[PDB]
Amino acid sequence: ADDIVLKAKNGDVKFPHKAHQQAVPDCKKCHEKGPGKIEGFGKEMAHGKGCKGCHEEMKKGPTKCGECHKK
């Protein structure tokens, strides 16, 4: 399957899966989550534990606006 881009108005956000599969061997951080997680994602989650928050906790991955968002 392919990577996906989240179409944030301020600039596309790429989500590269391979880097995540390699750096986050605890797959249950994202997979086998209960129902509602597809509907639930948005800016709040993304800037929280959905994206940015995990990068901060694990001490790796982009945490600056222009590192995630790029036109």
Ligand code: HEC
């Ligand atoms: C969130 C940060 C994730 C972590 C950690 C892991 N995966 Fe993942 N996976 C995630 C998304 C958003 C998607 C779909 C979008 C995409 O970029 O592919 C996936 C997809 C998979 C797939 C399908 C991949 C393919 O067919 O090319 C598999 C098999 C998969 N995920 C498994 C997997 C495993 C085993 C992980 C731990 C080592 C793992 N993922 C981490 C989100 C996230």
Ligand code: HEC
């Ligand atoms: C943990 C549960 C994570 C979640 C949820 C998300 N990311 Fe992540 N990401 C995580 C780690 C530990 C790393 C470092 C990987 C490395 O080897 O550098 C990353 C990395 C990225 C990257 C850069 C990948 C690279 O090749 O350097 C990007 C662009 C990125 N992450 C984006 C991203 C987005 C958009 C997420 C939410 C949709 C997201 N990540 C979630 C850990 C975790």
Ligand code: HEC
């Ligand atoms: C990755 C770890 C991110 C960082 C660092 C920042 N943002 Fe972000 N943002 C990210 C994603 C994956 C999304 C999309 C959420 C979704 O619905 O899929 C967003 C969203 C925004 C938005 C809203 C865009 C829209 O609703 O169309 C804005 C205005 C925004 N982001 C701005 C922004 C700024 C200023 C940041 C630095 C302070 C920043 N983001 C960090 C992922 C990530």
Ligand SMILES: C[C@H](CCC(=O)O)[C@H]1CC[C@H]2[C@@H]3CC[C@@H]4C[C@H](O)CC[C@]4(C)[C@H]3C[C@H](O)[C@]12C
């Ligand atoms: C559920 C995990 C981990 C965050 C959490 O604990 O809530 C998060 C991390 C990244 C999230 C995905 C990012 C890309 C997609 C955004 C869409 O708008 C909704 C479906 C997807 C596929 C999201 C589904 C789910 O919301 C994920 C996999």
